Symmetry: C3
Subunit: 652 residues, 3 copies
């Protein structure tokens, strides 16, 4: 590669392996790369009409799978919002459908709050997340809870299962299991009678040992020494451990206030020591630092606030934090174009004391997620709209623009003397749509899997949400919905001593609603599906016919609600026909079955009802007029032929 300084940007697309240093704003050089300069490329990873944004700062890799958690909503607020993730099982080439991790808050309507999250990661084989409850009205933090589950994982251990005759307690040795009482697990081929299939953790003895309860007592002494068996957690069946974090909430007291929790890093995996970033950007003087948890497994409510110096917390927010080899690294977001901005900091004593390096030129509006690879920090940020990156530049909103994403690479083999000469590289450009002031661009997160690093972050497209227009309600299903979606910049960070794993995708996408063309020539959908909105269809047959050909005897339509309504719309063609016909046979004719016809108010004879039952109409129970002494049985032109009763005297 080669880098040189230009007075004007050249035709960048013509070149390879080149980068151009250019001062768009005088005195603020940035470097613009051509293709081939870095071995990195951008992939779009969500494409839904929700406002999908804010991976900050939650990405992680676990058991070969890359997780990109984010929030799927409709605006910069918690209206209709789920904390969610998408995942990649192919090193970031393709990404799954969004999965909601939080439900809509149970008190959404009553208390006008909903969930939110910017801090999530894995520690000691458990997922941890700071799930915040925020007000719909003003986005203030009402309270915050640490949520945890055992991660989804698989083990193939040998031995370690013992049960005494007469006991219902089975003891299971499983190193660093990370389980808690009540967690859901599964066993196969255990070689220990009664320890099989789906079970629940009954007790935890130590880091490597737990118990489960058998349905019935063992009738011999059991020890599966020598037997190789299979174990899996059941993440989706395990109750979340939910622990309120005291004083983590909005407050008008500057020393209590928390604006956001953000970022997560493990200090000691086996002892559940980790840190969560936080700041107060609501009440001066600001505070920014970490919440340090000495042992989140045994004491999930116990943490201490460890802050950075005031002059680096001023005009700052949203620390990204990562621990490596005894050193905790931190970057901040600057909150003003006209004040000193983002800072890089490190601590060798778990946040009690820091060394600081300010980035020059008031880096602002972006968090700066990063990873350490070898001797370098790879640090990324994205401006919200074109031309806002440079210090002192004004916001550029309300028109469509191409915001720049930047990366720098800082050698920390020893702590740098200064970042005055930092070289930011513009590595990709995104789109800011422009018809609302808010931008989803950036607000990202960095993770690493083997020889690839991922900066996973937001960008938009030029299709308007029409908030100003016919969609002030921000309905995602109207027109093009919201243009905020996620992208992944995947950068090579080590030698790739293997032949390519890459592929082009040429398949029919078939996970969201899996369709196969049947031998009947019709599309079959092979998953249960719930439609959250109004559905119309040309005709409906309810089949009771499953995949393997089993035909149910009872075919069912069920209605929820306080009451169910099956009704007949006013006809468009011939309103005088209006009626609902319920049929015991295949067609609405008495040769095929009994029928009940309920006529509507538009019918020629409005609101009549007629029962047709050639085989006889029967009532199992007493049959009466609703009101006493008012309703006739038969009529003057509709006399029953004869009345049959056990007594021939009418009771008056």
């Amino acid at each position: 590669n080669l880098t040189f300084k230009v007075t004007t940007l050249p035709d960048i697309s013509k070149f390879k392996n080149a980068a151009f240093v250019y001062e768009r704003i005088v005195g603020q050089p940035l470097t613009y790369v051509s293709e081939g300069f870095f071995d990195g490329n951008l992939t779009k990873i969500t494409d839904t009409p929700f406002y999908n944004a804010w991976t900050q700062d939650k990405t992680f890799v676990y058991d070969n799978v890359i997780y990109a958690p984010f929030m799927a909503g409709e605006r910069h607020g918690v209206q209709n919002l789920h904390v969610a993730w998408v995942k990649s099982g192919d090193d970031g080439q393709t990404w799954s459908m969004p999965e909601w991790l939080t439900p809509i808050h149970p008190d959404y309507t009553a208390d006008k709050v909903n969930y939110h999250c910017m801090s999530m990661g894995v520690c000691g084989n458990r997922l941890y997340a700071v799930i915040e409850t925020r007000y719909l009205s003003n986005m203030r933090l009402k309270k915050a809870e640490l949520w945890s589950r055992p991660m989804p994982y698989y083990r193939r251990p040998t031995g370690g299962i013992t049960i005494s005759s007469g006991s219902t307690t089975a003891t299971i040795v499983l190193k660093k299991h990370g389980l808690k009482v009540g967690d859901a697990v599964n066993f196969s081929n255990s070689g220990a009678t009664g320890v099989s299939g789906n079970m629940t953790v009954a007790s935890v003895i130590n880091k490597d040992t737990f118990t489960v309860t058998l349905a019935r007592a063992a009738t011999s002494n059991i020890d599966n020494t020598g037997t190789t068996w299979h174990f899996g957690t059941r993440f989706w069946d395990s109750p979340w451990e939910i622990t309120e974090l005291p004083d983590v909430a909005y407050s008008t007291n500057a020393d209590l206030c928390v604006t956001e929790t953000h970022s997560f890093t493990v200090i000691d995996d086996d002892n559940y020591t980790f840190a969560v970033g936080y700041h107060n950007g609501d009440i001066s003087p600001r505070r920014l630092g970490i919440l340090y948890f000495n042992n989140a497994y045994s004491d999930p409510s116990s943490f201490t606030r460890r802050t950075i110096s005031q002059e680096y917390a001023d005009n700052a927010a949203e620390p990204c934090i990562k621990y490596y080899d005894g050193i905790l690294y931190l970057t901040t977001r600057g909150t003003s174009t006209s004040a000193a901005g983002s800072t890089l900091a490190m601590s060798a004593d778990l946040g009690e004391n820091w060394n600081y390096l300010r980035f020059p030129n008031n880096v602002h509006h972006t968090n700066l997620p990063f990873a350490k690879v070898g001797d370098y920090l790879y640090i990324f940020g994205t401006e919200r709209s074109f031309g806002e990156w440079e210090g002192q530049e004004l916001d550029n909103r309300y028109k469509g623009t191409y915001p720049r994403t930047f990366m720098c690479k800082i050698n920390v083999s020893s702590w740098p003397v200064s970042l005055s000469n930092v070289q930011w590289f513009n590595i990709t450009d995104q789109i800011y749509q422009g018809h609302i002031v808010n931008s989803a661009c950036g607000v990202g997160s960095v993770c690493v899997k083997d020889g690839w690093l991922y900066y996973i972050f937001g960008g938009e497209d030029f299709l308007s949400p029409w908030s100003i227009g016919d969609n002030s309600k921000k309905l995602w299903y109207k027109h093009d919905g919201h243009p905020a979606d996620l992208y992944s910049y995947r950068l090579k960070i080590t030698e790739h001593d293997f032949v390519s794993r890459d592929f082009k995708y040429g398949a029919t996408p078939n996970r969201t609603l899996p369709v196969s063309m049947g031998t009947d020539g019709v599309r079959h959908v092979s998953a249960p599906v719930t439609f959250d909105n109004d559905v119309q269809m040309y005709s409906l047959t309810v089949t009771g016919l499953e995949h393997d050909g089993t035909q149910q005897s009872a075919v069912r339509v069920k209605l929820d609600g306080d009451y169910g309504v099956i009704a007949k719309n006013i006809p468009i063609k011939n309103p005088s026909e209006q009626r609902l016909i319920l049929c015991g046979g295949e067609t609405p004719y008495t040769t095929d079955g009994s029928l009940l016809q309920l006529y509507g108010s538009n019918h020629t004879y409005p609101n009549r009802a007629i029962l047709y039952a050639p085989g006889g109409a029967y009532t199992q129970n007493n049959f009466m007029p609703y009101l006493d002494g008012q309703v006739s049985l038969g009529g003057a032109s509709n006399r029953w032929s004869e009345v049959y009763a056990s007594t021939g005297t009418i009771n008056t």
Copy 2:
């Protein structure tokens, strides 16, 4: 590495073994064409629709507006207007990815009664309004019954300062908004106006001038209002605005060759502020042909007023489907040639809005394709596609009824001065498409060109080798049978200026989630987050109707509604045990009386055919008079089904 140089070869080499090279080759003696390797042009092809409809004919409707690229086309089933919608797909990312089709016209309201439907090859934007010539054509023979100019305000956003005034006691608010393009009745939206009563969704009440309109307040102002100094937000509501629809006199088939119109095609603006524009047209039905433009001097104030301006007969003979574009006082035009054995496509220009033309015939009888183009700097970039392989060259015969790889071509004509001749025109084969082969018709080409910033787009048709089986089991041309129709759209995106920015490109690795947006819920089930209408028969294993919305609000009333003149809920003949056939309606959760009252209607196949039985442990009641339908014929009880006792206010039966 050919260093962007060109070679003349006796036979085509292994083109995939080179970059930045082009090869001049005469497949047909005397008719050289140039074949490019990767890299010769900074251009690439993207497939932009993938639906089982017959999706074809962007000609000549594409446009770019407020950063979005629009590719209008027709989605139907054949070369005809059966089942067809005028539609578009759009790109919000410079042509990398494209939206679901949106239908712009409904099926014609008189489709069945009058046997006609809509059609469009002319659409564009003038003065912040969408304009289209929406044709009504006969299903039987495709003849043009009538044509209408349709317009709406474009979807757009503004952020103005000041300009809203209201006098005390008035219900009229006056809105200054430059070049608004609105008409009375158009739908708009306001936010943060700083003017009481001017807020949310409103309708244009009157238009005062090009820069000023009014809206009507729900109640009279109680003071003089002027939002001077206030910055506010404005948006049109395109989809809520009525179309203005204007019949175009004599734009229809006619046996009079001076009236007859075969097709309207292409659109270009001459003056945006004064709504002056032209639409291409030709008569290819009645000799002598006519070809030229419909010129509208002011389509805003007088949408029905236009004049015909034709090219000369010499160049109208054997021609059709003019593409027209206006730049800096000059109207440029290309034609489609209609015969392999007569002089073909012509390039022309007019400095007087079509009253006179300067002509340049392309050599070698270019035919069967329209030639859409754009001017960029001193050059016209002109594109065309053969319908099937080997048809491009003059005098070549049609090559249908087998699968082939038709070539797409581009030429680049320097018009800094008008050329002396096109005899030396260099056509570059820039991409190859597929013609499927099992029907004579081809959707290849029939395209359109538009430009956004440093990219030009040729958006056009191609097929694939999957048969529609029109000869086979699908002569009805049902799109949902087998693979439907192979016609879909493609976009060739070509760099046409310096790109002084880092790449905006990305690879698409997302789960596509716009057509039926699905998320996996915390319940472990797929949730679909949009209303959906199924236009065909649906079957399902079981159904629960929930009344449960996204935010968790649960409706008290859960509803199943049936349209039609009458609604039928019926029980098919059982496959396993026909003698059980019955429908059970239940007031509780299961069909047992411990859970609720039940009505069972037995079918004709039941062991006890055609019985009805009502189960109501809490009592069965009728609010109204309850009678036999026939008089004197129906029994109440029976000899072995006696009521225990009868209770009535009078003990005398009325005979």
Copy 3:
């Protein structure tokens, strides 16, 4: 890239940074004594595409791929595990030279006796002969995967012709004779005609008789009234593949047996020897009973005699520890490769026969190639042969299986000159051309088990790979439900390799469309998504509300709108309310809303209602019964009650019948 290797090969001590090279290859001994070659981008003009993406366990193209009338077919099985539970034989297809691939189409239904007999279908041998599709459709036990029986299934291929002349009818006859060369049709096959120029020969018809290879008849709806001969008329013909019954023929003794000479473990691979005479071969082996047998089933004329075949085996030396032959016939020579079944015994062998499988010449691959079939095609003088290890590091001879953790198994290709048949394969050069993923949470791997086909200047190795998303069989999904979580990670890939000069401008495109074939959606002028195909949901559906419209695409509105229920009986029921259980009831309405001002109503109250289990009929226009109306029990049910007296009773006779 930094270094242009200029298509040269380096011998290296350890693999370098391969992604920094183009046009380069590296010979490396991961295992000492077993060199393999690793390629950078550009070394071969070949690239990988993912071609299925569904949550089923989609695997085993082996060895069924083929190209017909410009379309590439990739048949496979869509199921849930290494077994036939819930499984369909299926295919996906490409109409654009392998760039994009269709939704799966099920070719076999679930076996009609799946529940009663506990068996289901399976297939590893399929192809085209004489314009018909042929497949050996196996019936296997769910419990142990043994082969119960096997059937030869065939249909005419979907095809189109544009002939001239050839249709004759005698006056007075209802038989039309159709000349169509090598039609491949059988009696009962479904066809379609257009523009025949022969009265009565039009539209959808059925084959009535077959006269010879080039001639068949159809029956007219009425007798011709003149002598008809459409000589000089150009017309149109299509088969109707999907409307033609399958010809299904049992293959005697192709089944599990404890007799080593009858036992068939699998039928596998297909190749045509003579298209016009319907001579073809199907591979097979017995790997269940020692001594093993491996070879071909040779069908001399499958059209006239689909049940007639002979077994032709390779020598015991090369059948031992072997399975799953891939077989291909070219220019009078039949080539065969085997799968090796042990890492610690001599493995895959390449063989050729000049006499249709009676005698073979053999070449053992060195180093115990095992666990993979080796599909191939011949291009010029060379066989291009492909295989994939099941998990990383299993390829080399003697290496142990490496399961139960996620890994990146290697795919390999070699190129063997068979015009000059080698003396030995000792110096075979295997190239690692792409790497797949083995997910790791179950022992079984879908990687490989592939098939090779060719279209013009491109060769396709179409085969399996996984991804790292677990199926949770150990976890909450031991039932292997595809619709739970991410379903199964097994899906198909196509490695498309340039094999001739490409003397044309690129046909390639990037895909940037909204995928819209599975459930075709358009945004309507009503601002709602419309789905433009019939759809059947095989699982439970919930929806917020439902309107049944009777309104079709062209705007035609049905007078009768229909909801129908299958089953023995249909149930429409009211669940227990979550908000206010005391309201529980179902309201059936003749008008649009549940109020008597809009229509008659029948209200059925639930057991949780304030007044449990009542039924009330509201009929302001009068309630009528056409038929006799009676209590179900005799002498037990009252008509009216003490506080619910009818005003007056009207009957033709005033005496109650007791």
